[model samples]
Target: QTLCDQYATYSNGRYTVYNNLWGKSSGSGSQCTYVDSISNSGVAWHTTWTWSGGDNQVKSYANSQVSLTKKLVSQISSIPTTVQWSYDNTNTRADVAYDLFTAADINHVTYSGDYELMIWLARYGSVQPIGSQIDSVNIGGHTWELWYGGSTQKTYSFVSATPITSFSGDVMDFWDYLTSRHGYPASSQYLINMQFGTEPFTGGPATLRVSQWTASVN
Candidate 1:
């Protein structure tokens, strides 16, 4: 069903679907999110938007996020995630991605995390990530251009070289990449959140649809 409020959400099993128009005040036009179906297998959802005058800043992140108890990264065994998604207007100045967070402590109530890891499956138009390209790495069954930014709360982004319309892999592969290769302290950090969504900057009427978005942590 279509969501009314900007931050409205719907729960389905272990997931929560969101109409997170967090930056709507900075732009003109409107957007709506729909949670079509949710099953034991996965979630089906879509979001449509028409944005302008946001100056290429993201207008919203419409997503489905897994709700899980915070656990130290070192305590987790695996996180498997898969998706089959695409955008209606491939040139809509947006990004289809996964947003994952980790924190030094699990007791923090707020959503802010000590580290943010974003995996961009596809990017359209001129919208880049929060950081600059640092290196290219092969992991999670794909090749990605890695970027790093932020000092206080570190941010790492893995942007695919080409649009990836379908994915199937373990999310821990990424975590392992950072821990083993980049020296991320997995023992000190807890997995805070995991999400899949589309971040639209401008250029609509556009739609992002996920026919299958399945993920979980063990």
Candidate 2:
């Protein structure tokens, strides 16, 4: 347990950047360039960094483009739709709980007590954080997980790639059959294999985001 206590089980890390915006009237006059790529997972390092420019004078290079079997942590963060999750469409269990600090769409808590099942990332109208899918919350009985930062945490196989034929019923009739079978607008996509009981989701963490009413009791 060194390296900052082994950095919380070395989640995973990968970096890529290619900055552009050179001056001289945007013809590359002021000089600037950089291409960066990095991979990390407990010292499986695969780095690449490059920078070049002339007349302002600068040059840099760093190499080693391979060597990684695992260690590519993901959870980058991006989801704001004012914090998405507004469902109470006349209640049954579309169970709304979007009150990070009160942006007010209004439903005010009630998902089997204290909440925590957010998997936002699907934007179309401002508020940014575009779709991948994974949103859950059944409470204490179990079905707890959420994500926005990627490297995949949104479980149930990422909502099982959509198609919850009639959303299986209940929970507001599977949120009105996933808003008429996945045209999902106003409900903002996030319902996949919505489970919470009797051990399903075998392992823990690596990537999981499934919906379309995912299933597994064995």
Enumerate clash totals for all models, in the order shown: 0, 29
Q: Provide the overall lDDT of each model, using Cα atoms, as 2-decimal numbers.
A: 0.87, 0.20
Error of 2 at 108 (Å): 14
Best by lDDT: 1
Q: What digit string (tens of lDDT, one per residue) describes model 2 on residues 109-182?
A: 22111112222222111121213434654422224232232222311111212212122212332223333543
Regions more than 4 Å wrong, model 2 = 1-112, 128-211, 216-218
- Give stretches of model 1 more than 4 Å off: none
- lDDT, model 1, position 148: 92
